[PDB]
Amino acid sequence: RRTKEEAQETRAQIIEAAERAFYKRGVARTTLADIAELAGVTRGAIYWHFNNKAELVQALLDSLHETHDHLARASESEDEVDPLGCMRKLLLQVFNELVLDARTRRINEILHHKCEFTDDMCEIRQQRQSAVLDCHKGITLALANAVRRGQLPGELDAERAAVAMFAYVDGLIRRWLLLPDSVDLLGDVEKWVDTGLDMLRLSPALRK
Amino acid sequence: TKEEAQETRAQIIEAAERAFYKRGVARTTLADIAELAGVTRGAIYWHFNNKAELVQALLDSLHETHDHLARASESEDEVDPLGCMRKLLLQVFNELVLDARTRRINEILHHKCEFTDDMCEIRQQRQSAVLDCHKGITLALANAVRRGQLPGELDAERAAVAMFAYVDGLIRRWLLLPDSVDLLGDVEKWVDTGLDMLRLSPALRK
Ligand SMILES: Oc1ccc(/C=C/c2cc(O)cc(O)c2)cc1
Ligand SMILES: Oc1ccc(/C=C/c2cc(O)cc(O)c2)cc1
Ligand SMILES: [Mg+2]
Ligand SMILES: [Mg+2]
């Protein structure tokens, strides 16, 4: 109809086909030409939207923020009266979306288990570094806010606590992707979130 | 001869580490590895049925250093099982940071090895290996519980999952962003942060 609307539809068809192809065959051996054929678009069209497969990987990775942005910004705001509470809701939502949404599950499985870091495509590792560094910044801000509001210990090492928490969450996600039946991540989602928050609130090793 | 076969196998393993680390698992073939190792006339296929088996050899190689401390933590006659586990985890992080071989293998497993349907054995062998680690961790913690070193109502299974998640995530964080974690200089605090989760979180109780 209109150029932009047609372009948005094409882009979304490609991204969806990229998910399916990376998920079955992996990033290393999938080409844009392969994804174009699975999306039912021309090679000219796919290369118009994405210059290389690293950009297509980044589009998938960037798409994981959208759902959580509301709660993340709230937990990071200094004006929030209950920053720790926003973090808990954020973490529940992170796990809930991972188990229930096929798309989110698929993308995380791509990023964890179907995407390699090779100097052949150095930007895949550089983008991952940027993404994690950025999430670390946000976590540190929300923990520092929680400390200032009396919700976490006064001498918490916010930086180290932020690493601890991300490690725990990232490991649990990867474990659930590898062995879903090993973890009732949905039925016990509150215990899994609270286990991680307990570490930050109670461990003396995380204090200055 | 035994010696020359064992030496050829080792040369292949070290070559596989170099090739996988540079180009990744997905696109590296056994023939490429043999070319890098300088092994000829089909030698690699006598030592490894396929590429998955060679990946499993690298992962299996990580257990050797820690087997003593791991088995001790699992022994029902061990009087200090949690101390053996703390010694274990300190060694895991020290080796990661100090040993080029261990770091490089972990970077391969975490960041340079796809799981594909074409080669389903990689994912299945990783499942079995994590399940075996989890079985051992659970026995260590149950031992620690039995010996009054962790809370009597600890859910040993969920605790074992939590400890593994934290450790696995921290390694992977250190591999991606080394300068964000003083893993060696602060090793004791990183190990105790995780142990504190098990010792202290009410959410891991039954
Ligand atoms: O405070 C926190 C807020 C968010 C998170 C999310 C971590 C995460 C790690 C992954 O490997 C995949 C993913 O989709 C998310 C962790 C801590
Ligand atoms: O109690 C525990 C004993 C051992 C471990 C090992 C974890 C681990 C995770 C990795 O991704 C790589 C690795 O080389 C080791 C975790 C907990
Ligand atoms: Mg989302
Ligand atoms: Mg070793």
Residue numbers in the entry:
A (entry chain B): 3 to 210
B (entry chain A): 5 to 210
What does the paper say about this structure?
We chose TtgR, a ligand-inducible aTF belonging to the diverse TetR-like protein family, as a target for computational engineering of ligand specificity.
To understand the structural basis of TtgR-ligand interactions, we solved high-resolution crystal structures of quadruple mutant (resveratrol-bound and apo) and wild-type TtgR (resveratrol-bound) at a resolution of 1.9 Å or better. Although both naringenin and resveratrol bind in the vertical orientation, only N110 is able to make a hydrogen bond with both naringenin and resveratrol. The DNA-binding domains of the resveratrol-bound quadruple mutant and the resveratrol-bound wild type are extremely similar with an all-atom RMSD of 1.0 Å. The structural basis of ligand specificity relies on the I141W substitution to create a steric barrier to prevent binding in the vertical orientation, which is observed in wild-type TtgR for multiple ligands.
